[PDB]
Design a protein around this ligand. Structure first.
Ligand code: HEM
Ligand SMILES: [Zn+2]
Length: 119
């Protein structure tokens, strides 16, 4: 594909499975793919932002916090940005969730699967 901005559908999968993750409820698909100089960046909206305290994706054999490129405090959402390579390969990610009022404090591994062909 060539430089520009595109819609890309995706699903978040439970770690090491083809099952839909509980996290899938809290992301917006499609995400936005920016292609720039042969590199691919994904901008993804997280819902219930206040609950999601960390979000990381695999980068160079390690995990890195995705950049927050915008926040909407009124909507309680935010947009995070990270690099993808092969849009047909699963991307490993990590999430930390904290809901003080429900005593829910966990962190998880998940996979993101993009589907470039989907509309
Ligand atoms: C808000 C109320 C929430 C409740 C009641 C809840 C409940 C649960 C429960 C019971 C499980 C065990 C597996 C299952 O039953 O499906 C689970 C796992 C999991 N939850 Fe939560 N959760 C909540 C919020 C969130 C949020 C905001 C995220 C954002 C990432 C999240 C991500 C996950 C992940 C990644 C797992 C591991 C299994 C999977 O990937 O589906 N959850 N959750
Ligand atoms: Zn846990």
């Amino acid at each position: 594909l060539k430089d520009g901005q595109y819609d890309i559908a995706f699903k978040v999968l439970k770690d090491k499975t083809e099952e839909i993750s509980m996290m899938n409820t809290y992301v917006v698909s499609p995400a936005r793919l920016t292609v720039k100089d042969g590199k691919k960046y994904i901008a993804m909206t997280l819902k219930n932002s206040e609950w999601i305290t960390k979000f990381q994706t695999e980068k160079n054999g390690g995990f890195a916090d995705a950049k927050v490129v915008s926040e909407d405090k009124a909507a309680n959402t935010r947009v995070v940005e990270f690099e993808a390579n092969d849009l047909f390969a699963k991307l490993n990610a990590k999430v930390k969730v904290d809901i003080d009022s429900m005593n829910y404090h966990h962190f998880y591994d998940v996979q993101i699967q993009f589907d470039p062909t989907k509309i």
